[PDB]
């Protein structure tokens, strides 16, 4: 069997208009029982108390599944909902509708490589896991088996690695002392756990250097992590690329350097397969589907040898995420880009995908 | 009486750290005496209420007088201080010294035109004027003064106008650019009743007195320095500031070379917000976010700042307005 | 046909945290068909672009018309929903069910006049009416038919009136465009209760020209405007009781007491522990003050860029510390130095 | 020797407005001399790069020294200043101006105990220090100074110590590593701090101090500290008001703890047990007795409110919102915006003081 992946990229004038996302389904142009992610920006603070970014997903789920015919309870574990909540700027919100399905015959004429979705679920991650090795263990699991999923077994052609975990709220406390163990306090261990998962399964880093002490050198280029709520399944979505790929896109990935780098994201759409030297033609542009950029803050209050306040603001997260909408938009032109972070902080160095196409 | 202008870019740390301002003039590099402006970016909120901004003012105006020997009051006409607060993201705060002397003696193979900078005083601006044609006319007039200072006639070398008039706001600052409209002849004066591609307006207060800053080029000028402008097209938009750099004197198509990007001193970007929030096609939020005027400059900065790889840029803007935001580059001749 | 009114106060813990709500139905303890208004605080900014505020009307609305057996749509004239957006402080995210049903016996033990709540809609507020006299007639006319609704006559014995209005949206300018009209949130505000006043005759419709009791917000595109009024009157079935007062300046606890005497509590200066458990919900509306001078002071509040979540932070402050309910509604943070604020004790 | 303090609470419509502060000396009203401590409130965000705090600061210091007629460097370690930021609602920008000196002799008639103000400094504070037993010791020491700079001896006639501690700077940490120690910011020299109050006052054993409990047991704390900590500034600073039968002040002060973030009777303790006598309700002339209140309104242990959820712990504006409400509740009971409300950071019990008039019979 052969995987065929697409990108839908449809606007949202707030995180309920579903509109243009039900149109993708009525007008035929995609199955909605191929979906197997949405990936979408949301109006809102980006914060861990963003109710807006949740309506978004509430929204997305219920329309999917209209699309689908099922009710909305059996979305659970066969459609990856991942919601990033904060649009400052140039950054227009939207959804990105990620398709795939199998096919007995691979297409002849596509060049090199092509993208493959895969995902993977965590074991129940309890309380007092979060933040420790336990974490870190089944996250690689889920990581380990969404490469699988995708029929990928070299690292190197893995761009992309979302985890979705839990965070720690005063239930899961309550719960973990109801049955006598403790917790390592939240939301900032949750996600450094699970970003050393992603290392470990993509063999970033040696399992051996791995300890509860060590946990908060250790990175990996293509983790995009992020946690919160209360259910303990984790969930991974991993976007890579194969030879088996009957799909018209490509992915790629670089690290963007300091806060005022475009390179990463240069490097992102180049090794996606855009050749360009400086800057894109509108015809290039075009052909870029997705970018995918996590704008966490920098690890220094330094950029090009002068001071910068982005770490002492009190809007960090949001200017971060503005910031980073700016760099991506001024290259590709396209509004509807998924900037997440600025949570916290390669040292300095940020990671960002690119997807474009691949015709035959 | 050629002029001869220089733009010195020191940092600042805080709104009250004027100690590498200090330094220019104590180590010789910089002649206090000569200093016409400084133009500064403090970190807080940018808001009409920033006191940061106020703290930048106070603490500049004092050490440029101490580095002079007379005391803080004297500046009163002689220095333009302009403070922008609020900086975002990639913008480090500082302050652009602006010193102008005049040489008797016009030195040999400076190409084409140079910087040159002009300033002016408005008459008193009452309260009844604010917002309407006789401070529209106040403005024209400080332009029209400022322009004679610098020695320039011809308004399509005027490439910046900076004014800072009084508030009792948004009224103010619009019938100042009106101001630079008429004086530059971009609008005939005709077309004026109560009823600028260069302008840079700002207001707060209670000074009566409105201020004009000047800055363009002309062929008698003895400045190792050309100014140039652009006008950014949409919130997005990096043509305008690439506009600003080339026709300043920096030869490129796309993207600058470390050397090429070493050449540019200075931008002055006014990133007020879009005229509407359709950007390529597409819904943004930039006009319903609270912080609207925070990420307007931080999206200017990450434009700004990713061309010309300098985190010291004066970024300013955030005021309320389908695009058009002028932006000036001061690059080395 | 005697009137019986009930409130129910319960917690959310989000937005779409119906859990408490539901169960109120769930448990027998209220019936959902009788439900005439949901008006709730949610968590989130409170300002225009609020998008939780919505999320918990959205919410509200699907859980309602679960417990009753309709689909969401039909609630459609039938319940008010009312979600004032940003909780500040000390302020829990609720929702305040409000029932009312019609009966036979008049009981007795009953004490005085008791609470009745009346409703009404507007004819369709087009956007050439927004913020103009057209606009504070239909609302108005809402008004007396919100009056009519509850059974009473006398506006004296009206306490609360909270107004829903359209706001101008771009699509609304281009529709008055069209058809060659000219346009005039903050607008549609002041019509509206200035559309209170003339209704209640607090002011004359041929003419410092405030309703005491008026509770006006704005938005979306729905040219129906909505009135909700909180009243008394003799023939009242009700346990409970409305009473008002004017909060005088920002620092001012004596408005939220006063709306609570005159409902029916007798004390002083504080109340005990009982009586602060007989007021069973408040409704204050805190705009920002007039000016910046307070007891003879400068204070911050017209400048702060926070200004509305302040001002609902201080509001919440005052009204919680004297009943000891963190579920109480407080609104406001718009821009105007006198604030409503209205009671809801039990008669008992 | 008999102490006598004053306080003298005067508006600022800008960080920078020191019209009312100067007019304060220029009158002939107070003596710029007897100045030991300026406690102000200040427009701005309250959060630690407040720029506007420093330049209330810096302002205040340069009136004062033009006042005194000598150079604003010589204010170094004679006068407290002690600005907090943030000035949400009700809370009117202000500086309270306190001064004491010293007389031969006892005016008679005055009741009971009276004000007295005492200071202290610390040893300098290393990095290294910073939320450590260390800080918790030197502070200790600090506070011990300042109730004897103030002739007291009873703990219990303390009620406000202010603690101004360093907090955790880049270059800090990098001097630290220097010189081969460790370091773990400013919550943690907030707590180290308050410990030392807690310790110098009795209130708690020094036995029980480690740097595993400094901010785990919660248990052990200070009812009427007030920290705060920022700058590179090695060395901690002490304000201590307490009373004493020796005070020729025509004030005397009172604590009280607010129990949760909707109580008002802490505050009414405070001013009660300062002397006002009351059931419920201040009249206009018993407000009008209250001089002023230092209420720190730091964030909620809990989410939890009179068994309901509070938004409070998640709000980004917290700190603002905690200020609003402290200032809320304190103004509402004296009728003076400008008041002393400190706080913000995090943590269900907040400690306020009041001063009141002492008047001879």
Known sequence: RYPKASMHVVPMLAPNDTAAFRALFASGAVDPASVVALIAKSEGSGLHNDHARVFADVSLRTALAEARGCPVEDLADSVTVAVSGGSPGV???????????????????????????????????????????????????????????????????????????????????????????????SMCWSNDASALGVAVALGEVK???????????????????????????????????SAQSASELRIGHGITRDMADTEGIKTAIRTAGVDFDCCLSPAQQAQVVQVFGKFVLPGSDVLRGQHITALDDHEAHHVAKAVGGALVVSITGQPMSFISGGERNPPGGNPVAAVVRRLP
């Open 91 to 185: 950054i227009s919100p939207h959804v990105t509708v990620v398709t795939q399905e199998w096919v007995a015959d691979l297409p002849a004429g596509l060049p090199g490589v092509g993208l493959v979705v895969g995902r993977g679920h965590t074991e129940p991650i309890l309380p007092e896991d979060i933040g420790r090795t336990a974490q870190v263990d089944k996250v690689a699991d889920a990581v380990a088996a969404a490469m699988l999923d995708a029929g990928v077994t070299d690292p190197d052609d893995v761009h992309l690695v979302m985890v979705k975990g839990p965070a720690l709220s005063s239930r899961a406390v309550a719960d973990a002392l109801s049955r006598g163990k403790t917790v390592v306090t």
């Open 207 to 241: 399992r051996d250097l791995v300890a509860d002490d060590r946990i908060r050198d250790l990175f990996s280029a293509v983790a995009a992590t992020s946690s919160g709520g209360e259910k303990r399944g984790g969930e991974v979505l991993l976007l890579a690329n």
